[PDB]
Design a binder for this molecule. Sequence first.
Ligand SMILES: Cc1cc2nc3c(=O)[nH]c(=O)nc-3n(C[C@H](O)[C@H](O)[C@H](O)COP(=O)(O)OP(=O)(O)OC[C@H]3O[C@@H](n4cnc5c(N)ncnc54)[C@H](O)[C@@H]3O)c2cc1C
Length: 510
Amino acid sequence: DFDAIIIGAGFGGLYSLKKLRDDFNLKVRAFDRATEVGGTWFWNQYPGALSDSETHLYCYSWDKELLQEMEIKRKYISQPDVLAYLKRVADKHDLRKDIQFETGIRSAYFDEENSFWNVTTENDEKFTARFLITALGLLAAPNLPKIKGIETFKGELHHTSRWPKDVTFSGKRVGVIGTGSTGVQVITAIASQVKHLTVFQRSAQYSVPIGNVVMSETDVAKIKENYDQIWENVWNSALGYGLNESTLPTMSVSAEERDKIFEKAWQEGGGFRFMFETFGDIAVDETANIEAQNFIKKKISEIVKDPFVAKKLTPTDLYACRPLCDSGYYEIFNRDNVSLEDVKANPIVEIKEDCVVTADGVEHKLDMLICATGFDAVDGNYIRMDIRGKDGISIKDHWKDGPNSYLGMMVSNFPNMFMVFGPNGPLANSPPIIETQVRWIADLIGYAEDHQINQIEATKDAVDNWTNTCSDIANKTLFAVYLYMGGLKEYRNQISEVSNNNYKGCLLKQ
Ligand SMILES: Cc1cc2nc3c(=O)[nH]c(=O)nc-3n(C[C@H](O)[C@H](O)[C@H](O)COP(=O)(O)OP(=O)(O)OC[C@H]3O[C@@H](n4cnc5c(N)ncnc54)[C@H](O)[C@@H]3O)c2cc1C
């Protein structure tokens, strides 16, 4: 028996454990398949792995001593450092004693008679708890790509999601499949280290510089001395990325001024910065979206000296969502040991013992093939497990037509279960979202313990009304199963209205 069981020991699960155990004095256990804390920052050890938000914001804000104590080494934070930070959090707040590592949860069945969750590990261990905190998503299990004969490759075959240790690159011909955010990081990191790099791009995307530089002692002090305000700005923003979020229309200024504004964001770096600090309507106005793209296309044509290679790199879609971020990606393609294959025009048809073969019949001889096809679904990690709520219905079935929730945290027919960083949540920097949700969920659970209620469930009406809110907002924009896209501040307003009005939309049963 526990008051709560938590699944996941990443950002989400760790803070859930801290809040529920230490601030609400609940008896709680957390579980993870991993051998240590860190979540996706434990699993993803691929070359070039790097946060998308700046170091000083990609962290917890609730421990002020930790803010002052923590190293701010570079403007953005590498995977090994995020892992060390989360391990430090675990150290300081004595969290590991309440985490069971190497423990996959196979199933969670809700008991309506006793108003609690039956949780079964993959080693057939059974636990009971009133509440189930799911801090799971969304890192997809290493699915090898569906390519004929992939199993016959005798060289190294690595998936970015399970990057083994001790990989060396020198003297080797290497191929990478995928040019999403993960592929860009790996490609940029390894190109100078391999004998030859072949990039298999199915779909080109725009990338802007991340502009990751070392932070001076003076840079760090500016942040640490003003940390309270820096966080107040996060809570009062849409993205929580530390940006001066623009309301200026792209076409309201001259062509010369517009170039100047894009150029300033380009020099500073950051994907959301280029899209949201420059102007206020890039994700909304077609003309404005095209202007932004043309700025990046022009950069591609300038950096990549071979116009034919520049062309292949240039996305062909009419409108573009957020760009990726890089630390020298387009530069790579000027190298004599790098080949770009457009495998939309010239697809992979087979993989043989020593090569990737494209539809033109060319045998791309490889010593190593890397799958950076980090391809998933937002509710993938919920669907993967056997979760059953009311009348025994599975989450797989309830979401067969797609993930729907109330406030991104509650699923109708699944009482006493609360999602952290689940589907239909806000579009923003993750750790502020996760803090926002963990604190809301805990206050609700605390409310329940204080009013002697043992069953909390979102009504179908609240769920569909959340679906509606998301839809009305989302369809204002060009892009694009909806996130809530009103921003962090408004998401915080939405959930506050719920908690401030007796948790309307929630069935509270004594
Ligand atoms: C390289 C990289 C950079 C990123 N940068 C940013 C960024 O800058 N800003 C941002 O907002 N987001 C970023 N992300 C996205 C990232 O996923 C989130 O920031 C964050 O890691 C989510 O934390 P989480 O605790 O909710 O989930 P995770 O960190 O993924 O941890 C989930 C854990 O739950 C465990 N788990 C799940 N299911 C089960 C089960 N059935 N049994 C047992 N155990 C289980 C998993 O093993 C996993 O350890 C980045 C991702 C990557 C790969």
